[PDB]
């Protein structure tokens, strides 16, 4: 999981 | 995808193959002729579709067979088997729909559910859907658990989960049609703003971002190509691997510099040797010239030996003068090549101090994603759930995420302010012991056929126990509870009277002075109709900031904000709300991560129900009575709300299969  | 095709994808199901789930309920089919499997698969996908296109009404079996078509609608039993499997396991008629068939007058079985978080609420909703008698026991005065929304006047702001990660195969997609959720796309433009208050130049922004991603792949390479997963008897963490990758890139920069300077000195040496040859030759020319002049002085007429001397000394000087010409030809090229190397020097540093600080913000970003220091993440498995990614852009909830649990909760028997303290489970049933959170002297006893525990991992981790289990949970479950990690992440909600930021920016960074405070207020969100900025505290900062007053934390927030917009632009906030999830006793953390030394296998051990020993020794081994749901039990979709909704749906199905019985496996 990670974001933008 | 689209069609009956798309319904499978939008239910996290392979459209063309049968799952391990269905192999279990339909062993005839999967072991049967391949034509029948295709038949089953279509009537799976079509029912799926029928539910998905209108999920505000119950999908009955006989409303289903009507829209079904020949030759599929020929086997009335296979349709009934499929529909019931789907309905049991929460793939259809889950969420908030109008019951076509009304609820059974008389119920069967008794279930106690611990926690009205979304995992508990979804299970509860389904169990009541299935005709069981369910009660939820909630420690807090509200539903939702870690879905928490602040509401004062028109100011609304999630303290807990606030993002839906993409509607592509997301069960919350179904929910959004079913409940009025105002979903707002997240604009991916995010500008960093260093501690001075001046934006990072777009050119530096892009360069460091690609080193970050380059650095991530590098760890993946240490993990999978180099089996760098255990160091000196301890499992390697992601953070460790990032250091060793940064260090090796720092080492390589030194090696390039050394090798380049070493080439210069080798070329200098060549020169130095050339100059000595030239100096000797020039001195050797010297005495020859003198000798020729003396020989030339002897005026003619001369005897041949004297004439030969002239002619001789004249060859030699010409010859050695040819040789000194070839060597100032050779010093020419060496002199220019040395200038070339001096003007082509490799990078002095791998990352500048300003560059390294930007890198932190990407690391705090990642410490925000996994709500934990990168020193705790398992290098080997922290991205084990990478494959199950939802499609579509991420979204936020403008009306607050609470509207979902609050909606799930209607028609349900929730006892609030009811803190469970013991769970007793025996061959013949269970009793749960709870108190009143207001006055703890009051004491309640709840008797039931099964308990569904959705206690947060952080609660289950508490030492000494916040909840006693009688008898104690077996060592395999407690060991998974230790091994697994429960992270922390906190938010600061900032409530002003007028917008003073870029309103077409949802979100903007702040870059930390130090690397130790990289997560401390490193990011701000503007996703609400009202003027509310929301500031994250992640990584190590999260745990620290909980020992620090509200006001000083808003203090450091305002500081940050002044630097980016100017002390004159930013009012004092009307309302301030700072979260403390690790200190919260009903959560004791924000969500879990895959700790170094853990794996996704732990998430599955976390979901195995408990089966007590016999009361009467020699009596037949009993039914399982203690079931687990929640964010930490679903291995493929952990730490999210959708994973918590799915966990509850999975347990309801498993509980129904044991107490109501499965009549779809024949």
């Amino acid at each position: 999981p990670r974001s933008f | 995808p689209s069609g009956v095709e798309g319904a499978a994808f939008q239910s996290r199901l392979p459209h063309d193959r049968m799952t391990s789930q269905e192999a279990a309920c339909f062993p005839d089919i999967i072991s049967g002729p391949q034509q029948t499997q295709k038949v089953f698969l279509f009537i799976r996908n079509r029912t799926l579709q029928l539910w998905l296109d209108n999920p505000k009404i119950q999908l009955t079996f006989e409303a289903t067979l009507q829209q079904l078509e020949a030759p599929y609608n020929s086997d009335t039993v296979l349709v009934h088997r499929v529909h019931s499997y789907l309905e049991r396991h929460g793939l259809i008629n889950f969420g908030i729909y109008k019951r076509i068939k009304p609820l059974p007058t008389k119920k069967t079985g008794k279930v106690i559910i611990i926690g009205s978080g979304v995992s508990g609420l979804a299970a509860a909703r389904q169990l009541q859907s299935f005709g069981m008698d369910v009660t939820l026991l909630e420690a807090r005065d509200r539903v939702g658990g870690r879905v928490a929304t602040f509401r004062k006047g028109n100011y609304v702001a999630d303290l807990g989960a606030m993002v839906v990660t993409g509607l592509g195969g997301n069960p919350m997609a179904v929910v959004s049609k079913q409940v009025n959720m105002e979903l707002a796309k997240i604009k991916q433009k995010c500008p960093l703003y260093e501690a001075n208050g001046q934006a990072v130049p777009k050119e530096k922004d892009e360069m460091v971002e690609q080193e970050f991603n380059r650095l991530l792949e590098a760890t993946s390479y240490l993990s999978h190509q180099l089996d760098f997963n255990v160091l000196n008897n301890k499992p390697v963490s992601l953070g460790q691997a990032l250091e060793v990758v940064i260090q090796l890139q720092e080492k390589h920069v030194k090696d390039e510099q050394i090798e380049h300077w070493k080439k210069i000195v080798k070329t200098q040496e060549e020169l130095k040797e050339l100059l000595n040859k030239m100096v000797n030759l020039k001195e050797k020319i010297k005495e020859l010239h003198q000798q020729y002049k003396e020989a030339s002085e002897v005026k003619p007429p001369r005897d041949i030996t004297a004439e030969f001397l002239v002619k001789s000394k004249h060859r030699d000087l010409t010859a050695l003068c040819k040789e000194y010409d070839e060597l100032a030809e050779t010093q020419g090229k060496l002199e220019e090549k040395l200038q070339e190397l001096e003007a082509n020097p490799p990078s002095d540093v791998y990352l500048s101090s300003r560059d390294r600080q930007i890198l932190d913000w990407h690391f705090a970003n990642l410490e925000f994603a996994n709500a934990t220091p990168l020193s705790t993440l398992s290098l080997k498995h922290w991205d084990q759930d990478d494959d199950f990614e939802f499609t579509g852009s991420h979204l936020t909830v403008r009306n607050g995420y609470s509207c979902v649990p609050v909606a799930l909760a209607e028609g349900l028997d929730i006892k609030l302010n009811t803190a469970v303290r013991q769970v007793r489970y025996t061959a013949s049933g269970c009793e749960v012991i709870a108190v009143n959170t207001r006055s703890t002297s009051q004491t309640f006893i709840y008797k039931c056929d099964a308990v569904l525990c959705t206690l947060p991992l952080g609660v289950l981790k508490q030492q000494p126990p916040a909840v006693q289990f009688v008898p104690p949970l077996p060592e395999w479950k407690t060991s998974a509870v230790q091994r697994m990690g429960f992270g922390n992440l906190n938010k600061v909600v900032l409530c002003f009277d007028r917008v003073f930021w870029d309103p077409s920016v949802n979100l903007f960074g702040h870059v930390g002075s130090t690397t130790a405070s990289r997560g401390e207020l490193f990011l701000f969100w503007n996703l609400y109709k009202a003027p509310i900025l929301l500031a994250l505290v992640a990584g190590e900062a999260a745990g620290i900031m909980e020992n620090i007053s509200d006001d000083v934390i808003v203090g450091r927030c305002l500081a940050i904000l002044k630097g980016i917009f100017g002390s004159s632009a930013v009012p004092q906030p009307k309302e301030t709300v700072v979260s403390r999830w690790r200190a919260d006793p009903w959560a004791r953390g924000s969500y879990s991560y895959v700790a170094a030394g853990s794996s996704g296998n732990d998430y599955d051990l976390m979901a195995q129900p408990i089966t007590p020993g016999p009361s009467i020794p020699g009596a037949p081994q009993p039914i399982p009575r203690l079931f687990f749901a929640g964010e930490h039990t679903i291995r493929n979709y952990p730490a999210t709300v959708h994973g918590a909704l799915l966990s509850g749906l999975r347990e309801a199905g498993r509980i129904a299969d044991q107490f109501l019985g499965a009549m779809y496996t024949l």
């Binding site: - | 180099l226 100059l275 041949i304 030969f308 001789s312």
Partner: protein, 133 residues
């Protein structure tokens, strides 16, 4: 299956930096020191090479001599033969030299002349005693 291009990562390098806690800064101090030492060594040769360049001030322009150009002739003056016997004794077999000396006999004739008067000029002896040097 290969590290991202421009990342450097090898079993050898990785073990070296993980041998202890400080093995990282240890490795990177050694490399800082190899730098200064090489950089300081460069200074020396640049200073040492600078001095030599001062000694070669003006090159050899004063000591150069004008070139001689004159059509290769055919006949051997008595004088030219005598130049030859001498250039043989001082030059062994380097015909180009024996050329540059005589000036008008070019090169090919020297090899012929070498055998043509070999009996008369006792070149064998002249050559034998040139090798003796």
């Amino acid at each position: 299956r290969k590290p991202p291009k421009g990342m450097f990562l090898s079993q050898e390098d990785v073990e070296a930096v993980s041998a202890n806690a400080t093995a990282a800064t240890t490795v990177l101090r050694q490399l800082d020191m190899e730098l200064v030492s090489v950089k300081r060594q460069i200074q020396n040769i640049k200073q040492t090479n600078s001095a030599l360049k001062e000694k070669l001030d003006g090159g050899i322009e004063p000591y150069r001599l004008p070139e001689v150009i004159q059509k290769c002739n055919a006949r051997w003056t008595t004088e030219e033969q005598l130049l030859a016997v001498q250039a043989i004794r001082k030059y062994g077999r380097d015909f180009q030299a024996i050329s540059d000396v005589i000036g008008n006999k070019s090169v090919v004739q020297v090899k012929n002349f070498f055998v043509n008067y070999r009996r008369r000029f006792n070149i064998d002896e002249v050559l034998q005693e040139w090798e003796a040097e």
